[PDB]
Design a protein around this ligand. Structure first.
Ligand SMILES: Cc1cc2nc3c(=O)[nH]c(=O)nc-3n(C[C@H](O)[C@H](O)[C@H](O)COP(=O)(O)O)c2cc1C
Length: 350
């Protein structure tokens, strides 16, 4: 059984430990959506993580859903990300870019008046995050069949640009009710063409995006993110075990780097089903403590564990865990705010 502090190999890349930094949207890319020196220092100071998965990064204007979140479609953005990857590598870290398209989880304010796009014209519940004044999600536009290759081409170029920006790899964002998860689950995808109906058809787009990434990076440098509970952004599927199991089997057959599952452990968790179906490195996440995470590794339930909120507040989390030192508390007020306050001013032990 492995310790959290033992090395792990994902594909052909060795990680110094099994304490992973979860992808965290922080909205510090500013009006130009370009990564910058501040993000560089933020990531660099978390480089003692075995692996950093970057904040979700939009592969095209159409896949933007929040203010000041970065993209990976422009040459200006590539140069920005180069600052981040250079700084992370100088500090000894590894970093994967999370490739993102928000799909229906967006608003015309971010799309120059265009409707958000989706598998089917069905809006998610609640109100658009962060944007004031609060408003419901507008009903999205259902992608026409002949638009879907364009989405995949946007992901492919995203994966090309990540490679040009000097990342160690890319993670495909198939979770949290965003575009590929919308296609995946039958509450949001009600299509009757080849991208809807059956589990195979619903998983089709995700697998095409994964294959485009594999064409750019090879499978060894591609990860995928999933969230089986469907508990964010009005997700839900009639048979999660069947839907996600199929996806897990198909990704495992492609021998990708890892499968990252956001799913707190508990009575209804299907993570172990997904792990057996996948067969490769399995990263668990959500409400984990040091000890429950070590317990997961000891029981063969994960190969690595990711933390989000704790890495926000604790740049030196691995060493804090090592020493059983008190942890900083994260301040929700500055999760999405501008500038270095609540971003790079959380102190390391030193
Ligand atoms: C402020 C914030 C931003 C997040 N941004 C992303 C994101 O960009 N992409 C993603 O896949 N998950 C994102 N997440 C979810 C985290 O990656 C993680 O799965 C979740 O916080 C649960 O892990 P934790 O309990 O260790 O914090 C975000 C979470 C928070 C709190």
């Amino acid at each position: 059984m492995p310790s959290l502090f033992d090395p792990l190999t994902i594909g052909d890349l060795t990680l110094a430990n099994r304490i992973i930094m979860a992808p965290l949207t922080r909205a510090r890319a500013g009006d130009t959506r370009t990564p910058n020196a501040l993000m560089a220092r933020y990531y660099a100071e978390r480089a003692s993580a075995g692996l950093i998965i970057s904040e979700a990064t939009s592969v095209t204007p159409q896949g933007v859903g929040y203010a000041s979140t970065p993209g990976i479609w422009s040459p200006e953005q590539v140069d920005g990300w180069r600052l981040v990857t250079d700084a992370v590598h100088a500090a000894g870290g590894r970093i994967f870019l999370q490739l993102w398209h928000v799909g229906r989880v967006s608003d015309p304010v971010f799309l120059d008046g265009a409707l958000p796009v989706a598998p089917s014209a069905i809006a998610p519940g609640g109100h658009v995050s962060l944007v004031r004044p609060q408003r419901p999600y507008v009903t999205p536009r259902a992608l026409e069949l002949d638009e879907i290759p364009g989405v995949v081409a946007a992901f492919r170029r995203g994966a090309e640009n990540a490679r040009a920006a000097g990342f160690d790899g890319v993670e495909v964002h198939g979770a949290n009710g965003y575009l590929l998860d919308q296609f995946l689950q039958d509450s949001a995808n009600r299509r009757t063409d080849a991208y809807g109906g059956s589990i195979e058809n619903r998983a089709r787009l995700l697998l095409e995006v994964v294959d485009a990434a594999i064409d750019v990076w090879s499978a060894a440098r591609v990860g995928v993110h999933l969230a089986p509970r469907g508990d964010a952004h009005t997700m839900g599927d009639s048979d999660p075990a069947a839907t996600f199991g199929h996806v897990a089997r198909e990704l495992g057959r492609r021998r990708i780097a890892f499968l990252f599952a956001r799913e707190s452990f508990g009575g209804d968790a299907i993570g172990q089903q997904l792990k057996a179906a996948f067969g490769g490195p399995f990263i668990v996440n959500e409400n984990f403590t040091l000890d429950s995470a070590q317990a997961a590794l000891d029981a063969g339930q994960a190969d690595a564990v990711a933390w989000g909120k704790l890495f926000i507040a604790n740049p030196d989390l691995p060493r804090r865990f090592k020493l059983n030192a008190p942890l900083n508390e994260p301040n929700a007020a500055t999760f999405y705010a501008q500038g270095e306050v609540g971003y790079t001013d959380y102190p390391a032990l030193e």
